[PDB]
Design a protein around this ligand. Structure first.
Ligand SMILES: CCCCCCCC/C=C/CCCCCCCC(=O)N[C@@H](COP(=O)(O)OCC[N+](C)(C)C)[C@H](O)/C=C/CCCCCCCCCCCCC
Ligand SMILES: CCCCCCCC/C=C\CCCCCCCC(=O)N[C@@H](COP(=O)(O)OCC[N+](C)(C)C)[C@H](O)/C=C/CCCCCCCCCCCCC
Ligand SMILES: CCCCCCCC/C=C\CCCCCCCC(=O)N[C@@H](COP(=O)(O)OCC[N+](C)(C)C)[C@H](O)/C=C/CCCCCCCCCCCCC
Ligand SMILES: CCCCCCCC/C=C\CCCCCCCC(=O)N[C@@H](COP(=O)(O)OCC[N+](C)(C)C)[C@H](O)/C=C/CCCCCCCCCCCCC
Ligand SMILES: CCCCCCCC/C=C\CCCCCCCC(=O)N[C@@H](COP(=O)(O)OCC[N+](C)(C)C)[C@H](O)/C=C/CCCCCCCCCCCCC
Ligand SMILES: CCCCCCCC/C=C\CCCCCCCC(=O)N[C@@H](COP(=O)(O)OCC[N+](C)(C)C)[C@H](O)/C=C/CCCCCCCCCCCCC
Ligand SMILES: CCCCCCCC/C=C\CCCCCCCC(=O)N[C@@H](COP(=O)(O)OCC[N+](C)(C)C)[C@H](O)/C=C/CCCCCCCCCCCCC
Ligand SMILES: CCCCCCCC/C=C\CCCCCCCC(=O)N[C@@H](COP(=O)(O)OCC[N+](C)(C)C)[C@H](O)/C=C/CCCCCCCCCCCCC
Ligand SMILES: CCCCCCCC/C=C\CCCCCCCC(=O)N[C@@H](COP(=O)(O)OCC[N+](C)(C)C)[C@H](O)/C=C/CCCCCCCCCCCCC
Ligand SMILES: CCCCCCCC/C=C\CCCCCCCC(=O)N[C@@H](COP(=O)(O)OCC[N+](C)(C)C)[C@H](O)/C=C/CCCCCCCCCCCCC
Ligand SMILES: CCCCCCCC/C=C\CCCCCCCC(=O)N[C@@H](COP(=O)(O)OCC[N+](C)(C)C)[C@H](O)/C=C/CCCCCCCCCCCCC
Ligand SMILES: CC(C)CCC[C@@H](C)[C@H]1CC[C@H]2[C@@H]3CC=C4C[C@@H](O)CC[C@]4(C)[C@H]3CC[C@]12C
Ligand SMILES: CC(C)CCC[C@@H](C)[C@H]1CC[C@H]2[C@@H]3CC=C4C[C@@H](O)CC[C@]4(C)[C@H]3CC[C@]12C
Lengths: 446, 135, 446, 135, 135, 135
């Protein structure tokens, strides 16, 4: 039993099954409030064999991430692609607080760094249906039956509630590539001004953290006299003790379903229903360089509008799809009048955002301010300003979407209007956001 | 004396109109923007309305060569409720004293007033900006 | 044995049963005066198996809580959701007293911090009936028979007493997700002015406590020179010594019952019976900017009102549901005349609160003073003030509920009146509380 | 003399920071807000960063019974762009001359700077509000 | 002389009426608020009822360019029980001495009277505020 | 001279802290309650927090026999808002001039300050109660 590699474990049914069970390889991850914890219900049928490769090179690997709610994902040793795939679920299910140490203002930047001292034994691969090979992983009949039952409900709201329960029980993503072995991880976060040389800061933090893990102290001082708080994780102790040390790929659970059902599940998971309506020019505001338009007529009951826009053609109305419940982050937030010396609104729930400044006096008790709503942080992506006007007291920004090549990150071109200089004092932070196109479901009979 | 001068900038940061009433310069004169030689009568500011996001400038100063500062008063009034008084502003930059007076009196919770920029130590009373907000 | 995981324990019936018994996994948690102690009576039926996941990452975690009576819950390693679910019971059953080290005034804020050094082995999950899966937990027939007997009593008071005894015996919540392994815990509390940067204080306390547990001294000095008192708990010593180290989810025991019985049980547990009555304008007090209203006519025998209100339509009368008994916190408290230089009333019992200041001279021996009452600290939530009047001497506050999206936290909009400046000196603290909607039962034939 | 004075209020209405540099009162003295006696050192502002939406007051005035006005210079520079010069400001409120002066120079095309409130005819230089905004 | 003066504010912080009686200034003169020239007879105050939660001000001062202080007395009386004494107040702010006198004599257990602001060392007698409350 | 004196009673009627700052007696001397001989230092009050419902007394007066009066300044600032100024208070009870002076300046709008009890005609400035509240 000396010099056993992953091949010996896999070839032996007892040892192979012990590896599968002890590592929860048949279970998905539930990106919940507590982080990426595996589900307790098996998602796939037990394979007859595992595909694996052997790698025994021990080193220190450092990784950096700049997404906001990916602290726990980094703590689990998710590479860049896995964190990218898992970010929507963590962001949607995360717990928000205005006292978050992470900062991503226009002038300050924040980043998580993680150093892993690895003792690898190999990598294990799972074949997803989209790959097109013959040894695909088959979903357990229980999960398929649950999906069928969820989609068979009478009302769209019931379908969505059933799907939400199913994905909270079975998990949101499935780990398709995993690294077996032992690891010692050290994680930290750093905030710095954008003016500083980013490469120098990254190198300094990496050197400090790698020295910390290599010499394995809650506080580490780098060569630049940066005090970093370091969180340590031990996953090392004989094949009986090998554990998953790194995740190289995760596939969304919804992506494992067949295409006709995958489309329906994806559509029903969209937080908001959208609609295009006509607009009317706001009276007054003749000083401003551009016209301001708002939804025309009464807002249909149950729907909401997002803000003032410079578009003279149409406006987007959105309606939540999931009823509000305790322990669940609403898709939209209501706004309240500011404390004093400002007519602008403030988001009721922390970390939320709204797209445009209010061109008037905001009063949540009466329309059209009653139906103005913010957005959950996972719904929006930073935009780019276009300034109109030639004076500080009259210039206004139009928030155009940032062009991207992949449709996955496309945003609505609502042309939200922001005011360059808000009179008074104590105004809310200026919005610089655009709404994701993937978060809105159109043309539904609902 | 032209040395004694004051500039009051009423800035309506709210969304509702405000009115100026009973503007009276007991001493000195009201002059054009930056031209103390261009006298202006109080009628040009009596009853004017500062629409939201507008700035209205009142320049007051003493006579050219005289031991006479400039003192005056006016009332910010709300035209939405029958010209109800909002505040009573009184300024005094005297030639014969080293202390300048700028007093905002009256009270009604429906309005918020924030003034800044005054100088009460010596010399001219300075430029004063008054933000008004119907809230 | 070496290399055994939770899977090996669960596979063997003897080891699985030993794990279930030694950890009290079939028993509810009574949130009594002594803290969250498990019940001595089995609540659910013994399962034939357990759903479990394996996790062996040892690390130091930290949690913070702002609620007042959640010290013991924090000491038991309850996460935020579990503490939120369990807080009503603890508070209701807690032992109130003045000189409480906790401070939650409008100037200073107090919080609990806990650092757990965890050496986990996995997590065990149970299926609640609300989940809808086929492996739901089944309540033991004795508990169901007890509930049926309680609900079959002749009078509402007897039913409520029987339910109170039953829930004191069988517990108030059931742990649905529990982590197994070993844990070293260090807990502390800190009070600090609200002006101070909350994030900095939290970070300093976390660093100090994490250092204390990692180096494992009854007192700790942080970077900011804060002196902290730390309580240490040891739960670490072989699969025979594994114990519950963290509770990730709890479900109220009442929620486990069938819906027709669950509704009746939930309704019968409401402390107060509510009623709406006509109001009358208080004579005098013409100086005040707003009119003051009090319940019109004589209060019905056995009913009480909560204070003066600015609402001109109706007033809320309340009546206790459970008779006063030793060792049980009453729902309402009498008020007594102040010591000197004040006509305001003071709560007889330590930590209760009333909603409005008395506009007049309070005499507890004559009406309507004799029928004015305060509320148990679990009955109320902080409200918000709307100011009326132009001068300090005559200005008043109207207390409005803080709008929330979840109906569970809705509070009555009674428009309680609070005098801004109370003449004299030595007056009681100003109330800023609103009554919870969930604590009052309406339209009952009682 | 105390009769010569000026109050320069830097108001960063943009997003990126703006830094002050080379502040220097060739004549007169700086001092604290509302107190001409409490002299202050230029180091209290040198290298200071005016964060977005924040205001920073610089008070200058002639010495007590000196027959001296108050003159000075400073520069606004962009920290995010290697401390490139945004603008250079020169203020002068002479005692022996009636005409004051407040001149802003510079050719930075990615900043908008707007100043107002200065008095140039006679007496003090008044309160000058400067609004800065990085495009 | 006007340098000898006293202001007595009666503030009913309770919920029962209190009456002023036998108000009499043996030296000096009762006068109007902020106006030592507008003498007022004691009849303006004698027999008045303060009423809960409002203040009544009594202003006394010495005769102008006199070398005479102000000495006076009055009784706070409870009307609810046949006009019974609450307290008897005596004030003395003499012109030819340093020790001012402020004596609150009498006994009534049903009333509580606090007072503050008096100065007995030297100069004027100050603004004495007297909080009355029936318990 | 002790004949010129002032008492200032700051009463935090609100529910949040208010801090004293820059307390300075330019003339005369501060002293303890009821004893003009027991001089005290301005540090005894500088930076003090007046907790809600708390009262803080500041006693100032001229010298023991000097021809000086008394004069001073201080500021009320909001500790919870980065020590933002709430108000600036100036008091003056001169020995030579008959007229006294009590001036409250500032523009903080989320605070309500009400002062009463001052005497301005002749003699000592008196006792001034300043009720402060934060909306
Ligand atoms: C032919 C013969 C001529 C000579 C005879 C002398 C005549 C003088 C009369 C006798 C009264 C003497 C009062 C002294 C009080 C001492 C206490 C005091 O006034 N001391 C300081 C500080 O007092 P402070 O207020 O700070 O309290 C702290 C002190 N304390 C004691 C209270 C603890 C305070 O500033 C100073 C005040 C100035 C008072 C001086 C007035 C005398 C003027 C001399 C005139 C000489 C002209 C001569 C021409 C021929
Ligand atoms: C035997 C013959 C004796 C003759 C008697 C003369 C005595 C003078 C007494 C009366 C005081 C006059 C106060 C009037 C104030 C004018 C208004 C003002 O205060 N004036 C300011 C600035 O005013 P301003 O700025 O507005 O002017 C600019 C306007 N402009 C538009 C042009 C720019 C300007 O600095 C201030 C100057 C200070 C006053 C100068 C005093 C001259 C002293 C001469 C002594 C002669 C002794 C001879 C012994 C042999
Ligand atoms: C052979 C010799 C014959 C000639 C001698 C005749 C003497 C002149 C007689 C009459 C003077 C009367 C002034 C007329 C203007 C009064 C207007 C006013 O009233 N001027 C107030 C305004 O000042 P302020 O700005 O503060 O008021 C506004 C603010 N306020 C709050 C108060 C409303 C301010 O005090 C007053 C200051 C006056 C300046 C001082 C001038 C000195 C006079 C001595 C000249 C000596 C020459 C010597 C020759 C040998
Ligand atoms: C035979 C030999 C005789 C020799 C004669 C020598 C005379 C020299 C001539 C004159 C130049 C000397 C003035 C220099 C002013 C510079 C200081 C200043 O301009 N001073 C202001 C600013 O004062 P500021 O308010 O700023 O001070 C701070 C205030 N604080 C309260 C805090 C102290 C203050 O106000 C007001 C100033 C006005 C002053 C009027 C002019 C002076 C009158 C001369 C009378 C001469 C009669 C001659 C008889 C023989
Ligand atoms: C036989 C008859 C003789 C008559 C006697 C005449 C005496 C003059 C009377 C009284 C002047 C009053 C000045 C007080 C200044 C206050 C401090 C100050 O003004 N000092 C500096 C600036 O200092 P700073 O700005 O820092 O403020 C200070 C900060 N502080 C905290 C301390 C307030 C500032 O330049 C100084 C300017 C100088 C102006 C005065 C010049 C007097 C000339 C007289 C010549 C007499 C020759 C003939 C003698 C036989
Ligand atoms: C028989 C005995 C007779 C004795 C007579 C001796 C007189 C003393 C000589 C002369 C002193 C000269 C002071 C030095 C300058 C002060 C500092 C300064 O520097 N003063 C500039 C400040 O000006 P500014 O404030 O505007 O500078 C800011 C802007 N700048 C860009 C220029 C810097 C400003 O100009 C200059 C103004 C000139 C001062 C006028 C007062 C002089 C009074 C003459 C009295 C004559 C009586 C005759 C009796 C017979
Ligand atoms: C040729 C024959 C000359 C000798 C006969 C005269 C004898 C004098 C006797 C006795 C008078 C004094 C009575 C007491 C004052 C009562 C009024 C008051 O005490 N007065 C205060 C202030 O009074 P007030 O402020 O209240 O006025 C109201 C305010 N208002 C603004 C409205 C007016 C003010 O400080 C007080 C000042 C008095 C100081 C006393 C100094 C004694 C004077 C010796 C003169 C000797 C001259 C000799 C020449 C040859
Ligand atoms: C070479 C010649 C030199 C000598 C000339 C000196 C002239 C004196 C100048 C003017 C002093 C001003 C006096 C005070 C004004 C009266 C106001 C007043 O105080 N009068 C009543 C107060 O009455 P009251 O306060 O109730 O109302 C008042 C009414 N008001 C409506 C205004 C309020 C109060 O009792 C009466 C007080 C007694 C009066 C004192 C008189 C002393 C003067 C002795 C002069 C002796 C010279 C002879 C030497 C040989
Ligand atoms: C050529 C003609 C000859 C002239 C001869 C000079 C006669 C002087 C006049 C007659 C005395 C007048 C006093 C009685 C005043 C009546 C008012 C009163 O009576 N004044 C009391 C009351 O004031 P009080 O403070 O006590 O009030 C508190 C009330 N209380 C009940 C509690 C006491 C207070 O004290 C005491 C005041 C005393 C002030 C008198 C100062 C005058 C000094 C004279 C100097 C002599 C110079 C000589 C030059 C030729
Ligand atoms: C022929 C020569 C003539 C010239 C002589 C030179 C003197 C010039 C005038 C005198 C100075 C000028 C006063 C300034 C200081 C007063 C400070 C003060 O205002 N003093 C108060 C008290 O102050 P305070 O109450 O605070 O002390 C109490 C402290 N204690 C603890 C004890 C209670 C007390 O009322 C006030 C009294 C009034 C003082 C004026 C008296 C006039 C004197 C006329 C007689 C002259 C001699 C005649 C010879 C023939
Ligand atoms: C052979 C003899 C030759 C010599 C005789 C005379 C020599 C005089 C010497 C000494 C100077 C005296 C100044 C001292 C300043 C004190 C500090 C101050 O400065 N005292 C202020 C307090 O001012 P205030 O109390 O009002 O307020 C404070 C300021 N504030 C800005 C806050 C308002 C206030 O003005 C000052 C008033 C005092 C005036 C008294 C006048 C009567 C006494 C002279 C009578 C002489 C007759 C003689 C006959 C033979
Ligand atoms: C030899 C004798 C006759 C010469 C007399 C010269 C006199 C008349 C001169 C000297 C100083 C002069 C003053 C100097 C300054 C000013 C200030 C100005 O704003 C008004 C004129 C005024 C007030 C002047 C008036 C005339 C004046 C008083
Ligand atoms: C006869 C000889 C000595 C000439 C006398 C000239 C006198 C009367 C002159 C010289 C300076 C002059 C003053 C100069 C300036 C002013 C200021 C003005 O606002 C009112 C007039 C006033 C106050 C003048 C009044 C008359 C005045 C005092």
């Amino acid at each position: 039993q000396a010099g056993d590699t992953l091949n010996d474990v896999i070839q032996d049914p007892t040892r192979r099954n012990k590896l599968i069970n002890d590592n929860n390889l048949l279970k998905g991850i539930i990106m919940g409030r507590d982080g990426p914890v595996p589900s307790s219900r098996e998602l796939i049928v037990r394979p007859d064999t595992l595909r694996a490769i052997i790698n025994n090179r021990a080193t220190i690997e450092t990784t950096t991430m700049e997404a906001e709610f990916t602290e726990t994902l980094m703590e689990s040793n998710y590479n860049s692609a896995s964190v990218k795939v898992s970010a929507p679920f963590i962001t949607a299910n995360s717990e928000y607080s205005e006292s978050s140490s992470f900062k991503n203002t226009e002038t300050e930047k924040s980043m998580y760094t993680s150093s892993r001292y690895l003792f690898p034994q190999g990598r294990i691969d799972f074949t997803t249906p989209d790959s097109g090979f013959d040894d695909v992983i088959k979903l357990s009949p229980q999960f398929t039956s649950g999906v069928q039952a969820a989609l068979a409900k009478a009302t769209g709201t019931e379908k969505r509630e059933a799907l939400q329960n199913l994905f909270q029980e079975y998990g949101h993503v499935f780990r398709t590539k995993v690294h077996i072995g032992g690891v010692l991880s050290a994680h930290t976060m750093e905030t710095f001004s954008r003016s500083e040389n980013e490469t120098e800061v990254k190198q300094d933090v990496k050197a400090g953290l790698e020295g910390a893990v290599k010499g394995w102290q809650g506080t580490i001082t780098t060569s630049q006299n940066r005090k970093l708080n370091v969180k340590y994780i031990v996953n090392v102790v004989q094949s009986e003790h090998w554990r998953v040390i790194e995740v190289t790929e995760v596939t969304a659970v919804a992506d494992l379903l067949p295409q006709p059902i995958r489309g329906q599940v994806k559509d029903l998971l969209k937080p908001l229903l959208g609609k295009w309506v006509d607009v009317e020019k706001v009276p007054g505001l003749e000083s401003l360089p551009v016209s301001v338009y708002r939804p025309k007529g009464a807002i249909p009951a149950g729907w909401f509008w997002l803000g003032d826009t410079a578009d003279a053609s149409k406006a987007l109305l959105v309606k939540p799809t999931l009823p509000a419940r305790s322990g669940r982050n609403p898709a939209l937030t209501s706004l309240h009048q500011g404390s004093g010396m400002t007519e602008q609104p403030f988001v009721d729930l922390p970390q939320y955002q709204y797209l445009s400044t209010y061109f008037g006096s905001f009063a949540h008790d009466t329309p059209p301010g009653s139906t103005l709503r913010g957005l959950r942080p996972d719904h929006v992506l930073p935009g780019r300003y276009e300034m109109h006007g030639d004076t500080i007291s009259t210039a206004v920004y139009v928030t155009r979407p940032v062009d991207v090549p992949f449709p996955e990150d496309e945003c609505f071109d609502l042309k939200s209007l922001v005011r360059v200089k808000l009179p008074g004092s104590g105004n809310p932070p200026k919005p610089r956001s655009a709404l994701k196109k993937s978060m809105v479901l159109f043309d539904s009979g609902e | 004396a032209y040395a004694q001068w004051v500039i009051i900038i009423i800035h309506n940061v709210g969304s509702q109109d405000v009115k100026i009433k009973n503007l009276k310069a007991s001493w000195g004169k009201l002059h054009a923007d930056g031209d103390k030689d261009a006298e202006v009568s109080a009628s040009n500011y009596e009853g004017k309305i500062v629409k939201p996001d507008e700035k209205l400038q009142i320049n007051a100063s003493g006579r050219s060569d005289a031991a006479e500062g400039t003192t005056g008063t006016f009332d910010l009034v709300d035209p939405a409720d029958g010209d109800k008084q909002v505040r009573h502003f009184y300024w005094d930059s005297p030639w014969g004293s080293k202390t300048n007076t700028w007093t905002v009196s009256g009270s009604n919770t429906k309005w918020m007033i924030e003034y800044s920029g005054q100088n009460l130590d010596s010399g001219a009373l300075g430029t004063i900006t008054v933000d008004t907000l119907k809230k």
